[PDB]
């Protein structure tokens, strides 16, 4: 009866909290049965001329030294509860946060003609929050904020965590300019300030180690049933859920966990946009993640968690759902069963590249060990996330690999060296926070030499 | 046809290059036009590895003229993808599409200008 319309409410809800508002409310009208059945097949675009923000916190590692792990969900919440609200107030669409950094997007359902205006207000306005916050709580933290324009194509990829997303090299301009950028300013293009109409603080803010410039501001019941607790297994893990029941919140720390980003290197250059769109190459890449996806039903996969999926990169954690001790097994297998699942993703991109015609797709893989913590973000809104040290170490030696090679943390190497896997050393690589870090490849001379 | 693993061992023996196997299975009644989970048809694997042997033999076996993948490519858009000009001809021969363009939108002959091979674009510009 009434249990009913309760479970709608809660379906539409948890709809609106991995995906938006206008696809949400046009696919309930099942303008596709295959996307219903998904549910249990969808549209991919490309649009031009869009505005794209990114902001994050300065000195990020410094507020999290010695916490309890639970003032920064406390105040991760109030941050974000201020921005997202400061959102309906100027009409902007969130994508999603990385830890440490939030970005918006203007414009992505319909064009406005008013984008950049409104995006500028966000900066401002999320500068003069961080300023109260700062000013209340007494937590010297500044945001480093970025901006852009131009085009990029929006779709939802994946079928296990899928979200949302928008991919085009602009989200990297956006994200280097705002590296590029100081606190308390916002750092625009001149993209973007092709129709500013100078009603605010121009200066030229240009680099002191590309047309930019700086701002310094002014029966259907199990049915429904059935959909919705998948819906929720898609958001939010089991443990958290069952958690979550007698509480309100979630947070929780774990002093040593493993973690591995992978990310396919030569996808870059296949962007040939000829075709109106370049629609069909994104499928291509829904079907390998997809792929991927079904990767995770065997029996030995239960201990690995998929968290997000980065633009086109990938990121898997384990050893934190292992609560039960039992003193018959070794707790430090988790490494190495993650380890192996990283070797049979290398394994299915190398059949995926053979049964496909006329392109090889390689992949970096960076893998890191060590403590972190983890957390849920939203309310009425519902995100999964972890932050730490080693996710950002993990990140960085990522970026420092070479394709096809298994790049992996001197302490990790000193862990997995007696057990047996081979590798060679590759040299030292700065790393900021923790300076020099050695580098270690686990192919052993695949190539020709 | 039912169990259509001989489709499997057909087209592995295609892309293998290994014709008395052909000829076996074709013996056993396998059918001439097997497909994959991608779309992939025996004839293009022919236009992959370039063996105009096998490819009389799948004409001879009675293939499509216009095979499609799940990117909806014809052979010879395939053949003009990889350049492989006396296969070029010998399927135009048969007379296929001359405008046709796969859900990419493109006609065979920009993209045989843009994979390095002028030949298959000359060849094909004669057409009526």
Request: proline share 2%; with cysteine.
């Amino acid at each position: 009866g009434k249990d009913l319309e309760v479970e709608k409410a809660l379906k539409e809800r948890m709809i609106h909290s991995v995906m938006p508002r206008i696809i949400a409310d046009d696919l309930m009208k099942q303008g596709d049965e295959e996307s219903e059945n998904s549910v249990k097949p969808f549209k991919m675009q490309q649009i031009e001329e869009v505005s794209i923000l990114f902001a994050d916190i300065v000195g990020f590692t410094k507020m999290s030294a010695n916490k309890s792990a639970h003032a920064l969900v406390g105040l991760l919440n109030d941050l974000f509860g201020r921005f997202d609200r400061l959102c309906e107030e100027t009409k902007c669409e969130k994508i999603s946060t990385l830890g440490d950094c939030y970005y918006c997007v203007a414009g992505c359902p319909e064009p406005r003609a008013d984008h950049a205006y409104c995006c500028i207000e966000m900066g401002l306005g999320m500068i003069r929050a961080i300023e109260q916050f700062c000013q209340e709580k007494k937590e010297m933290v500044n945001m480093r904020v970025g901006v852009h324009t131009g085009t990029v194509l929006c779709g939802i990829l994946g079928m296990r965590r899928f979200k949302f997303d928008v991919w085009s090299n602009d989200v990297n301009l956006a994200n280097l300019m705002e590296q590029l950028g100081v606190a308390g300013k916002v750092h625009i293009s001149e993209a973007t300030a092709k129709y500013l109409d100078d009603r605010y603080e121009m200066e030229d803010g240009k680099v002191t180690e590309l047309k930019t410039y700086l701002i310094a501001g002014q029966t259907k019941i199990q049915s429904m049933r059935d959909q919705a607790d998948w819906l929720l297994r898609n958001i939010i893990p089991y443990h958290v859920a069952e958690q979550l029941k007698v509480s309100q919140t979630y947070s929780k720390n774990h002093d040593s966990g493993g973690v591995i980003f992978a990310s396919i290197v030569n996808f870059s250059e296949f962007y040939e946009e000829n075709y109106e769109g370049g629609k069909e190459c994104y499928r291509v890449l829904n079907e390998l993640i997809g792929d991927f996806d079904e990767l995770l039903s065997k029996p030995d996969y239960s201990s690995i968690e998929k968290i997000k999926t980065i633009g086109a990169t990938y990121m898997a954690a384990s050893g934190l759902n292992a609560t039960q001790c039992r003193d018959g097994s070794h707790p430090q297998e988790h490494l190495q069963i993650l380890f192996e699942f990283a070797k049979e993703m290398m394994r299915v991109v190398d059949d995926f590249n053979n049964n496909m015609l006329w392109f090889n797709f390689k992949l970096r893989v960076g893998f890191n060990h060590g403590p972190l913590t983890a957390g849920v973000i939203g309310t009425t809104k519902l995100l999964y996330d972890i932050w730490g040290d080693t996710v950002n170490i993990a990140s960085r030696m990522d970026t420092t690999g070479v394709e096809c090679r298994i790049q992996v943390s001197e302490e990790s190497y000193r862990v997995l060296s007696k057990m047996g896997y081979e590798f060679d050393y590759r040299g030292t690589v700065n790393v900021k926070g923790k300076g020099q870090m050695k580098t270690y490849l686990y192919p052993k001379c695949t190539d020709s030499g | 046809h039912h169990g259509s693993d001989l489709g499997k061992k057909l087209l592995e023996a295609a892309r293998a290059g290994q014709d008395d196997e052909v000829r076996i299975l074709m013996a056993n009644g396998a059918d001439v036009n097997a497909t994959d989970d991608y779309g992939h048809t025996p004839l293009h694997l022919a236009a992959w590895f370039g063996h105009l042997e096998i490819v009389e033999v799948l004409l001879k076996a009675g293939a499509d003229v216009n095979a499609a993948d799940w990117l909806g490519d014809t052979p010879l858009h395939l053949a003009a993808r990889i350049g492989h000009l006396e296969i070029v001809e010998v399927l135009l021969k048969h007379g296929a599409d001359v405008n046709a363009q796969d859900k990419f939108g493109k006609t065979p002959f920009d993209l045989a200008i843009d994979n390095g091979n002028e030949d298959i674009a000359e060849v094909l510009q004669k057409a009526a």
